[PDB]
Amino acid sequence: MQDLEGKVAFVTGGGSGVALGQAKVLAEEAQMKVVIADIRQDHLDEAMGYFSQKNVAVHPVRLDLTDRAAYAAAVDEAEQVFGPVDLLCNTAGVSQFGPIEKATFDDWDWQMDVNVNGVINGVMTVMPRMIERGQGGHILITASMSAFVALPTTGIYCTTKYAVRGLAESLRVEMPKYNIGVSLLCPGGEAVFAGLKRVIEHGFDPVDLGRVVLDAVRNDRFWVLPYPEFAEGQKARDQEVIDAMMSYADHPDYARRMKIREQMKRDMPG
């Protein structure tokens, strides 16, 4: 998405953390009109304490993103204050780690509601409006490296981030025909992976990561995983699945399916 100046961004969890970093970069550098949605009023107040000292257009709204009615109202408010949402940043998220066998249903429901339903709610509230308007748009989903890597004690969290990864890849297929871009950001949160992530944690900066997002939005990039370190580790994870698939290359039914495909490339147009 180009020409971001004056366009409207809606950032969940925007009162703190990664989301605040995104809000800062979009409002200051990109000069977008940014709505920051956060459940906590004090976090909103803090962010506005910062933005009140900058030449920006930022509007706070207190929102529990698990509340579908309130979400719709918050987006209505965004439209009245600034205008139709051009860029949706689904960046809000929670995490509570522990052994999976000790997890409660309340633990599951809480993280599922915020991390998955929160993203679903935003997408389903905003994306149909984008399509109706017919001026395109962009949808950012902030997942995690946990959408690729399961770890001890991150069972629930991992499940929620895989989920929104699937949603993101699904949007990626159906949104382009509406000129709506889709980006999937995986900041994070093999003991080798832990050691590599820890160094990333040490250098991590929300504003710097915000500029990575900005770059991805401008150039309409889907995969936003700015970590070359994880490459060899991911290749190994990928190869497990490939090897699993190829372990049945021997099995007769496969040769039978290949016999049919061979015959069907003959006979027919293309």
Added chain:
Amino acid sequence: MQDLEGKVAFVTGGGSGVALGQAKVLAEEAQMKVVIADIRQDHLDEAMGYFSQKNVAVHPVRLDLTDRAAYAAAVDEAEQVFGPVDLLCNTAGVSQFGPIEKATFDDWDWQMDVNVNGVINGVMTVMPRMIERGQGGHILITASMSAFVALPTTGIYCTTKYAVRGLAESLRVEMPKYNIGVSLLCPGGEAVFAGLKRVIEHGFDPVDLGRVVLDAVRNDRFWVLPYPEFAEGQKARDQEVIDAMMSYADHPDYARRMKIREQMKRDMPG
């Protein structure tokens, strides 16, 4: 998991489809004591019509797997009739396809509850009992090739199957220390992928797929994707992510993180 004869299997959705195929193979070939759990009584009756003509130990229980209290009761019933669950097959699943922009919240909630919460409910009901018993066990999660491949109109379904894939990979990390095996089956449900899957659909048989599962359980295999055809397609999908990661190999912060790692392999033990 070995020595399956006489051991107890709990199969959700066991009254029909893939799940019934699993139940048949476990009850007849493996000679397990199989509990089939299904929401529909008539499907239960049909399956029992079949099993009543075989020398098997099969017990039906009508269960809405989205009902946590009922699920616990169904597993209690399994313990009273046969004994503690040794093999849990989370195979129940629903699907309703359509353009994502037309999806309702009811569409989301329904498929999320059955496909994701249904699996969570089973795992959280049975797995702590397995651990408490201290005799190990095995957990099968039946996802889909949609846990790897997003497709037009499969947005909700894809999201739910990615989710349980994450849960499966999470279980894979934490369960081995309790001698509990984990298997992830992806039957299915690039226009090339569609064409390849259609030929698989044509040859698909629930009993044959049931024998694939049996083989995976016996040999404690996690990745159960018996389709070599999808290899080259998946490699291409994998390479997108690798290339995305490596696209920042140039960026200074990465070289900075590598400088730190280089120094830390020196200095310290290992």
